[PDB]
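Lab notebook, bench 4. We co-purified these components, and the gel suggests they stay together. Before we commit to crystallization screens, I want a quick structural picture of the whole thing.
Request: model the full complex, all chains together.
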Amino acid sequence: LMNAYENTQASESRIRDTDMAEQMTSFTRYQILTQAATSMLAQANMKSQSVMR
Amino acid sequence: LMNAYENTQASESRIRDTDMAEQMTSFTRYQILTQAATSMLAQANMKSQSVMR
Amino acid sequence: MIINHNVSAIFAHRTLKSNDANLSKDIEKLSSGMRINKAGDDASGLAVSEKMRTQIA
Amino acid sequence: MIINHNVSAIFAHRTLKSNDANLSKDIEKLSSGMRINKAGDDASGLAVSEKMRTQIA
Amino acid sequence: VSQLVDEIDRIASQAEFNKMKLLTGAFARLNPTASMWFHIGANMHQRERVYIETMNT
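Here is the predicted assembly.
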Protein backbone atom coordinates (compact mmCIF):
# COMPACT_ATOMS: atom_id res chain seq x y z
CA LEU A 1 0.00 0.00 0.00
CA MET A 2 2.79 2.44 0.88
CA ASN A 3 4.44 1.77 -2.48
CA ALA A 4 1.35 2.64 -4.54
CA TYR A 5 0.81 5.66 -2.30
CA GLU A 6 4.28 6.94 -3.22
CA ASN A 7 3.68 6.30 -6.91
CA THR A 8 0.20 7.84 -7.01
CA GLN A 9 1.32 10.90 -5.05
CA ALA A 10 4.21 11.26 -7.49
CA SER A 11 1.81 10.94 -10.43
CA GLU A 12 -0.52 13.46 -8.81
CA SER A 13 2.18 16.08 -8.28
CA ARG A 14 3.27 15.86 -11.92
CA ILE A 15 -0.13 17.20 -13.04
CA ARG A 16 -1.26 19.46 -10.19
CA ASP A 17 1.75 21.17 -8.56
CA THR A 18 3.55 24.03 -10.28
CA ASP A 19 7.22 24.27 -11.25
CA MET A 20 8.38 27.32 -9.31
CA ALA A 21 11.49 27.81 -11.46
CA GLU A 22 9.48 27.69 -14.69
CA GLN A 23 6.69 29.82 -13.25
CA MET A 24 8.97 32.73 -12.31
CA THR A 25 10.07 32.78 -15.95
CA SER A 26 6.59 33.42 -17.37
CA PHE A 27 5.79 35.72 -14.46
CA THR A 28 8.82 37.86 -15.28
CA ARG A 29 7.96 37.91 -18.99
CA TYR A 30 4.56 39.47 -18.33
CA GLN A 31 5.77 41.91 -15.68
CA ILE A 32 8.24 43.49 -18.12
CA LEU A 33 5.61 43.34 -20.88
CA THR A 34 3.40 45.30 -18.48
CA GLN A 35 6.00 48.04 -18.01
CA ALA A 36 6.58 48.21 -21.76
CA ALA A 37 2.98 49.04 -22.67
CA THR A 38 2.65 51.37 -19.68
CA SER A 39 5.67 53.40 -20.82
CA MET A 40 4.42 53.29 -24.40
CA LEU A 41 0.97 54.28 -23.14
CA ALA A 42 2.28 57.64 -21.92
CA GLN A 43 3.98 58.09 -25.29
CA ALA A 44 0.68 57.70 -27.14
CA ASN A 45 -1.01 60.19 -24.81
CA MET A 46 1.61 62.89 -25.39
CA LYS A 47 1.62 62.12 -29.12
CA SER A 48 -1.23 64.42 -30.13
CA GLN A 49 0.01 67.55 -28.35
CA SER A 50 2.28 68.33 -31.32
CA VAL A 51 -0.45 69.88 -33.49
CA MET A 52 -1.65 72.11 -30.63
CA ARG A 53 1.10 74.63 -31.47
CA LEU B 1 -16.62 32.06 3.08
CA MET B 2 -13.16 33.36 2.18
CA ASN B 3 -13.54 31.84 -1.29
CA ALA B 4 -16.91 33.56 -1.71
CA TYR B 5 -15.51 36.86 -0.42
CA GLU B 6 -12.75 36.79 -3.04
CA ASN B 7 -15.08 35.99 -5.95
CA THR B 8 -17.67 38.53 -4.80
CA GLN B 9 -15.06 41.27 -4.42
CA ALA B 10 -13.79 40.48 -7.91
CA SER B 11 -17.19 40.90 -9.56
CA GLU B 12 -17.87 44.12 -7.65
CA SER B 13 -14.45 45.46 -8.66
CA ARG B 14 -15.04 44.63 -12.33
CA ILE B 15 -18.16 46.83 -12.24
CA ARG B 16 -17.32 49.76 -9.94
CA ASP B 17 -13.55 50.33 -10.02
CA THR B 18 -12.20 52.37 -12.92
CA ASP B 19 -9.57 51.25 -15.41
CA MET B 20 -7.06 54.02 -14.74
CA ALA B 21 -5.09 53.31 -17.91
CA GLU B 22 -8.15 53.64 -20.15
CA GLN B 23 -9.43 56.56 -18.08
CA MET B 24 -6.24 58.56 -18.71
CA THR B 25 -6.75 58.08 -22.45
CA SER B 26 -10.02 60.01 -22.34
CA PHE B 27 -8.73 62.65 -19.92
CA THR B 28 -5.82 63.51 -22.20
CA ARG B 29 -8.09 63.34 -25.25
CA TYR B 30 -10.66 65.72 -23.75
CA GLN B 31 -7.93 68.02 -22.40
CA ILE B 32 -6.56 68.56 -25.92
CA LEU B 33 -9.98 69.39 -27.39
CA THR B 34 -10.39 72.08 -24.74
CA GLN B 35 -7.17 73.72 -25.95
CA ALA B 36 -8.26 73.37 -29.57
CA ALA B 37 -11.57 75.06 -28.78
CA THR B 38 -9.93 77.83 -26.75
CA SER B 39 -7.52 78.54 -29.60
CA MET B 40 -10.25 78.58 -32.26
CA LEU B 41 -12.42 80.63 -29.91
CA ALA B 42 -9.73 83.32 -29.87
CA GLN B 43 -9.54 83.26 -33.67
CA ALA B 44 -13.28 83.90 -34.06
CA ASN B 45 -13.12 87.01 -31.87
CA MET B 46 -10.28 88.36 -34.01
CA LYS B 47 -12.23 87.55 -37.18
CA SER B 48 -14.52 90.53 -36.58
CA GLN B 49 -12.01 93.37 -36.97
CA SER B 50 -11.14 92.52 -40.58
CA VAL B 51 -13.75 94.84 -42.13
CA MET B 52 -13.28 97.70 -39.66
CA ARG B 53 -10.75 99.11 -42.15
CA MET C 1 -3.57 64.85 -37.42
CA ILE C 2 -6.67 63.35 -35.81
CA ILE C 3 -7.05 64.65 -32.26
CA ASN C 4 -10.49 63.22 -31.44
CA HIS C 5 -9.38 59.59 -31.29
CA ASN C 6 -6.02 58.12 -30.29
CA VAL C 7 -5.92 54.68 -31.89
CA SER C 8 -2.33 54.35 -30.69
CA ALA C 9 -3.39 54.77 -27.06
CA ILE C 10 -6.28 52.39 -27.73
CA PHE C 11 -3.91 49.63 -28.86
CA ALA C 12 -1.45 50.40 -26.06
CA HIS C 13 -4.10 50.07 -23.34
CA ARG C 14 -5.77 47.03 -24.90
CA THR C 15 -2.54 45.02 -24.90
CA LEU C 16 -1.84 46.29 -21.38
CA LYS C 17 -5.17 44.79 -20.29
CA SER C 18 -4.33 41.30 -21.56
CA ASN C 19 -0.86 41.46 -20.02
CA ASP C 20 -2.21 42.35 -16.57
CA ALA C 21 -4.61 39.42 -16.94
CA ASN C 22 -1.86 36.88 -17.64
CA LEU C 23 0.23 38.42 -14.86
CA SER C 24 -2.52 37.77 -12.30
CA LYS C 25 -2.87 34.14 -13.39
CA ASP C 26 0.85 33.69 -12.70
CA ILE C 27 0.49 35.11 -9.19
CA GLU C 28 -2.07 32.38 -8.51
CA LYS C 29 0.24 29.49 -9.38
CA LEU C 30 3.14 31.08 -7.50
CA SER C 31 1.23 31.90 -4.31
CA SER C 32 -0.55 28.54 -4.08
CA GLY C 33 2.13 26.28 -5.57
CA MET C 34 -0.44 24.45 -7.71
CA ARG C 35 -0.59 24.58 -11.50
CA ILE C 36 -4.41 24.30 -11.64
CA ASN C 37 -6.39 26.50 -9.25
CA LYS C 38 -9.70 27.09 -11.04
CA ALA C 39 -11.60 25.22 -13.72
CA GLY C 40 -10.55 26.18 -17.24
CA ASP C 41 -6.82 26.13 -16.55
CA ASP C 42 -7.00 22.38 -17.16
CA ALA C 43 -10.42 20.74 -16.91
CA SER C 44 -9.31 17.20 -17.74
CA GLY C 45 -6.20 17.54 -15.59
CA LEU C 46 -8.19 18.77 -12.59
CA ALA C 47 -10.49 15.77 -13.03
CA VAL C 48 -7.64 13.24 -12.96
CA SER C 49 -5.87 15.18 -10.20
CA GLU C 50 -8.90 14.94 -7.91
CA LYS C 51 -9.34 11.23 -8.66
CA MET C 52 -5.72 10.72 -7.66
CA ARG C 53 -6.27 12.79 -4.51
CA THR C 54 -9.15 10.41 -3.87
CA GLN C 55 -6.84 7.39 -4.10
CA ILE C 56 -4.03 9.05 -2.13
CA ALA C 57 -6.18 9.67 0.94
CA MET D 1 2.84 85.21 -55.45
CA ILE D 2 -0.06 82.74 -55.41
CA ILE D 3 -2.38 82.95 -52.40
CA ASN D 4 -5.14 80.65 -53.71
CA HIS D 5 -3.10 77.53 -52.87
CA ASN D 6 -0.13 76.73 -50.63
CA VAL D 7 1.73 73.85 -52.27
CA SER D 8 4.40 74.13 -49.58
CA ALA D 9 1.71 73.58 -46.95
CA ILE D 10 0.20 70.78 -49.05
CA PHE D 11 3.58 69.05 -49.23
CA ALA D 12 4.33 69.55 -45.53
CA HIS D 13 1.09 67.87 -44.45
CA ARG D 14 1.49 64.91 -46.81
CA THR D 15 4.96 64.33 -45.37
CA LEU D 16 3.62 64.81 -41.84
CA LYS D 17 0.82 62.32 -42.52
CA SER D 18 3.02 59.33 -43.37
CA ASN D 19 5.38 60.09 -40.49
CA ASP D 20 2.38 59.95 -38.15
CA ALA D 21 1.34 56.63 -39.69
CA ASN D 22 4.87 55.26 -39.31
CA LEU D 23 5.06 56.60 -35.76
CA SER D 24 1.93 54.66 -34.77
CA LYS D 25 3.24 51.29 -35.94
CA ASP D 26 6.28 51.88 -33.74
CA ILE D 27 4.11 52.42 -30.65
CA GLU D 28 2.32 49.17 -31.49
CA LYS D 29 5.47 47.05 -31.63
CA LEU D 30 6.98 48.51 -28.47
CA SER D 31 3.81 48.38 -26.35
CA SER D 32 2.93 44.83 -27.41
CA GLY D 33 6.53 43.61 -27.33
CA MET D 34 6.14 41.82 -30.68
CA ARG D 35 7.43 42.80 -34.11
CA ILE D 36 4.32 41.45 -35.87
CA ASN D 37 0.95 42.56 -34.51
CA LYS D 38 -1.34 42.58 -37.57
CA ALA D 39 -1.30 40.94 -40.97
CA GLY D 40 0.87 42.72 -43.54
CA ASP D 41 3.89 43.52 -41.36
CA ASP D 42 5.30 40.13 -42.37
CA ALA D 43 2.76 37.74 -43.88
CA SER D 44 5.12 34.79 -44.22
CA GLY D 45 6.66 35.53 -40.83
CA LEU D 46 3.29 35.46 -39.09
CA ALA D 47 2.43 32.20 -40.87
CA VAL D 48 5.75 30.70 -39.76
CA SER D 49 5.43 32.20 -36.28
CA GLU D 50 2.04 30.60 -35.64
CA LYS D 51 3.14 27.12 -36.72
CA MET D 52 6.05 27.52 -34.31
CA ARG D 53 3.63 28.60 -31.57
CA THR D 54 1.58 25.55 -32.52
CA GLN D 55 4.53 23.25 -31.84
CA ILE D 56 5.66 25.11 -28.71
CA ALA D 57 2.32 24.35 -27.08
CA VAL E 1 17.77 -2.47 -26.79
CA SER E 2 14.57 -3.19 -28.72
CA GLN E 3 13.12 -0.18 -26.89
CA LEU E 4 16.22 1.96 -27.44
CA VAL E 5 16.51 1.04 -31.12
CA ASP E 6 12.90 2.05 -31.79
CA GLU E 7 13.40 5.42 -30.10
CA ILE E 8 16.37 6.07 -32.40
CA ASP E 9 14.03 5.19 -35.26
CA ARG E 10 11.45 7.46 -33.63
CA ILE E 11 13.83 10.42 -33.42
CA ALA E 12 14.77 10.26 -37.09
CA SER E 13 11.12 10.02 -38.16
CA GLN E 14 9.81 12.71 -35.78
CA ALA E 15 12.60 15.31 -35.98
CA GLU E 16 11.20 18.29 -37.88
CA PHE E 17 11.66 22.02 -38.36
CA ASN E 18 8.77 24.06 -39.78
CA LYS E 19 7.13 20.83 -40.99
CA MET E 20 10.32 19.68 -42.77
CA LYS E 21 11.94 16.34 -41.96
CA LEU E 22 15.56 16.85 -40.92
CA LEU E 23 17.07 13.47 -39.97
CA THR E 24 15.49 11.19 -42.58
CA GLY E 25 17.97 11.91 -45.39
CA ALA E 26 16.35 14.82 -47.25
CA PHE E 27 19.52 16.94 -47.08
CA ALA E 28 22.23 14.32 -47.65
CA ARG E 29 24.82 14.43 -50.43
CA LEU E 30 24.61 11.05 -52.18
CA ASN E 31 20.84 10.76 -52.78
CA PRO E 32 19.14 13.92 -51.54
CA THR E 33 15.48 14.63 -52.17
CA ALA E 34 15.74 18.36 -51.40
CA SER E 35 18.38 21.07 -51.10
CA MET E 36 18.83 23.33 -48.08
CA TRP E 37 20.14 26.72 -49.18
CA PHE E 38 20.83 29.61 -46.81
CA HIS E 39 20.49 32.65 -49.07
CA ILE E 40 22.64 34.99 -47.01
CA GLY E 41 23.17 37.80 -49.52
CA ALA E 42 21.29 40.72 -51.02
CA ASN E 43 21.91 39.56 -54.60
CA MET E 44 20.61 36.83 -56.87
CA HIS E 45 23.11 33.99 -56.32
CA GLN E 46 24.50 34.78 -52.85
CA ARG E 47 23.57 31.45 -51.23
CA GLU E 48 25.27 28.47 -49.56
CA ARG E 49 24.12 24.86 -49.19
CA VAL E 50 23.90 22.62 -46.11
CA TYR E 51 24.21 18.84 -45.85
CA ILE E 52 22.69 16.71 -43.08
CA GLU E 53 23.07 12.95 -43.37
CA THR E 54 20.63 10.15 -42.65
CA MET E 55 20.58 9.34 -38.93
CA ASN E 56 18.34 6.29 -38.53
CA THR E 57 19.37 2.84 -37.34
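Chain A has two helices and no strands. Worth comparing against the SEC data before the next meeting. The radius of gyration of chain A is 24 Å.
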